[PDB]
């Protein structure tokens, strides 16, 4: 009773000239290829000790996608993509206890094109310490999803926000979180 | 900023049914969110999904050794990549971390893998099928899952069944 | 083991 799906997902986007290459396993990222550093980036560090991937093959695919995009743009008579604003959800990794280490998760879902600005706001002010984020993850509807993380010690005097900017949004979207 | 965007997507999909016994391979090309051409291992050749992929389907199917290559992808690509990561993907097991606590107007299951899980409320010694409020399966994006299953209603026991454990996990309150 | 990328095909012109 082993039913699984492995997807190699690639995209290239003009005129931003940004592409990505990743492997998906049942909705989780196995790895992606950092185009700038030409390196295989495993979602979990332990994966790199068990398997390997020559990142150069990903750069070759992205180049083909770039050349194919210019052709497909001509076939459609330069029909652009329609913006789709994202759904944004903020949650925690584990139940919240005072002064007990935890991490906030900002989940961005059902959006295209894959270009977003994300900012964590602590008491309305930006915070950039220890934050991490994932690459754009594929969806079955061929939109995208994305995960942002913010570790934090929960306190009654601290209030957090996840500010997301997208071209499909008429104004910046802001999702709120605070301790009861 | 105001200038329009254009997106090309490619998805090479391997669908596994009962391990590597039954495998379906899909080579999919997209313009924006529209699939314009596709190779289906059940079909055996490239087919245009829309009129946009009609040139590619005709061109690719005519290439030397193309049909032979793509018909072998279930073995050379799907079944191979399945075995490369089997030990830390298909066989990955992380047991759940269960905490039971009440709230003012809750069985919290956190950090488990895979996503298939089964949780029940017992109160007491007989499972309670009424008043169950389940948040559903939530993917954390870090190869872990979590879920909140609430009950508003004595010994309370939350019973969690997960493929990482050989027997049910019970937490009382 | 080594993951095998499926190569992207050049579109018809």
């Amino acid at each position, epitope marked *: 009773k082993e039913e699984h799906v492995i997807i190699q997902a690639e995209f290239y986007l003009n005129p931003d000239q940004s592409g990505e290459f990743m492997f998906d396993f049942d909705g989780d990222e196995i790895f992606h290829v950092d185009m700038a550093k030409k390196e295989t980036v495993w979602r979990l560090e332990e994966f790199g000790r068990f398997a390997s991937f020559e990142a*150069q093959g990903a750069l070759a695919n992205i180049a083909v996608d770039k050349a194919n995009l210019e052709i497909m743009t001509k076939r459609s008579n330069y029909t652009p993509i329609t913006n789709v604003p994202p759904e944004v959800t903020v949650l925690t990794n584990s139940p919240v206890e005072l002064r007990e280490p935890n991490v906030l998760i900002c989940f961005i879902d059902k959006f295209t094109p894959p270009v977003v600005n994300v900012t964590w706001l602590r008491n309305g002010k930006p915070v950039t310490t220890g934050v991490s984020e994932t690459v754009f993850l594929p969806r079955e509807d061929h939109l995208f999803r994305k995960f942002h993380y913010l570790p934090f010690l929960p306190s009654t005097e601290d209030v957090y926000d996840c500010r997301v900017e997208h071209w499909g949004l008429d104004e910046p979207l802001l999702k709120h979180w605070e301790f009861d | 900023d105001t200038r329009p965007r254009f997106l090309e997507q490619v998805k090479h999909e391997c669908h596994f049914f009962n391990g590597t016994e039954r495998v379906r391979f899909l080579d999919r090309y997209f313009y924006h969110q529209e699939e314009y051409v596709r190779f289906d291992s059940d079909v055996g050749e490239y087919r245009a999904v829309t009129e946009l992929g009609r040139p590619d389907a005709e061109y690719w199917n005519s290439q030397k050794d193309l049909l032979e290559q793509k018909r072998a992808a279930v073995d050379t690509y799907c079944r191979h990549n399945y075995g490369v990561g089997e030990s830390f993907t298909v066989q990955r097991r992380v047991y759940p971390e269960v905490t039971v606590y009440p709230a003012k107007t809750v069985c919290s299951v956190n950090g488990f893998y895979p996503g298939s899980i089964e949780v029940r409320w017992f109160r007491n010694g007989q499972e309670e099928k009424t008043g169950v409020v389940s948040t559903g399966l939530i993917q954390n994006g870090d190869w872990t899952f979590q879920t909140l299953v609430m009950l508003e209603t004595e010994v309370y026991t939350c019973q969690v069944e997960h493929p990482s454990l050989t027997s049910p996990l019970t937490v009382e309150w | 083991g080594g993951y095998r990328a499926r190569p992207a095909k050049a579109a018809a012109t």
Partner: T-cell receptor
Amino acid sequence: DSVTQTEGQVTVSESKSLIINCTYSATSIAYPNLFWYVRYPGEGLQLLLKVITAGQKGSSRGFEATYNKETTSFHLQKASVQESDSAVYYCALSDSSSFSKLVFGQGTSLSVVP
Amino acid sequence: AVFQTPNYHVTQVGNEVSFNCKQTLGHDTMYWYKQDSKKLLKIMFSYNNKQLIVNETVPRRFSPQSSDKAHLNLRIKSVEPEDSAVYLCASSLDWASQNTLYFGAGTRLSVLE
């Protein structure tokens, strides 16, 4: 990384059995693809046969080669060589984890004598 | 088919030579291989869709060129005596290692002092 095959010229009478040895060094490439290419006199290089699955054997034109995992070999055999088999035979491999890059052996010149 | 030119060429050390190749198989990937005097076959370049993907420590004397998927040309800027060899053009469906390579007839180069 390296392919070693029978060196130099081999002379065989027609209808005799033939073996052309080929071994590969399983060093950095964990799972190679194995090929035999043939160049008939006055012609260009072309594939004789290949095996891309460890364990299986490939066959063409009465020739036969087994991708032997344990022996790390890909020996080429034929039960009865014909005079038209006279050619140069190349054993080759490619790393199955990256771009196609054929690593050729030194080549074996076969002369089938009537 | 895989066509390449010229079939033979003699030139003096320090001169410039240009080889041209074409394949009609509809393939994305094309190669240049060198067959030296000992008849050892070694890859030089691999191009996929007009982009270099493999360069086996080839001296900068060699300048491959591809403005089209079916074409792969090679220019040696200032030939040296060790460049005397047979240069083989090849193509494959894509850069997947399982693919069969289809070779041309070869360009026989003789560089003389």
